[PDB]
C-alpha cells in the first residue's frame, strides 16, 4: 500500500530500520521530527481529518 | 519542510503566549485571600478586592 516510511541508512547503504508513519502518533512524531528517538514532550504531527 | 516550519513557529508561539502570562501572575505561586476584617484606618478596599 502506498505508506510513508522514515528510514534511517547505515555506512553501507542498508536501510537498518524503518518507522510505518501510518500506525500511531509515536511514529508519525518520529517521521515528523526525521528521528527515530522522540523525549519528553507535546507534538503536532498531524491534524486528523 | 517548508510548512513543518510555519506549523512549529505557530506553535512555538502558542507556547510563549502561556509564558508570558505565567511571569507576570504566577510569579508567586502562593494563593492569598482577601482581609477578613475590613479595618483599613479611613481606607476602604472593597474596591479593588
Known amino acids: 500500500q502506498p505508506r510513508t516510511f522514515l528510514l534511517k541508512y547505515n555506512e553501507n547503504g542498508t536501510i537498518t530500520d524503518a518507522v510505518d508513519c501510518a500506525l500511531d502518533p509515536l511514529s508519525e512524531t518520529k517521521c515528523t521530527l526525521k528521528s527515530f528517538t522522540v523525549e519528553k514532550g507535546i507534538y503536532q504531527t498531524s491534524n486528523f481529518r | ?49
Do not use: H
Not at chain 2, 1 to 6: A, K, P, Y
Not at chain 2, 9 to 26: H, M, R, S, Y
Open chain 2, 1 to 49: 519542510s517548508f510548512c513543518t516550519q510555519l506549523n512549529r513557529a505557530l506553535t512555538g508561539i502558542a507556547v510563549e503566549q502561556d509564558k508570558n502570562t505565567q511571569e507576570v501572575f504566577a510569579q508567586v505561586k502562593q494563593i492569598y485571600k482577601t482581609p477578613p476584617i475590613k479595618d483599613f484606618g479611613g481606607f476602604n478596599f472593597s474596591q479593588i478586592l
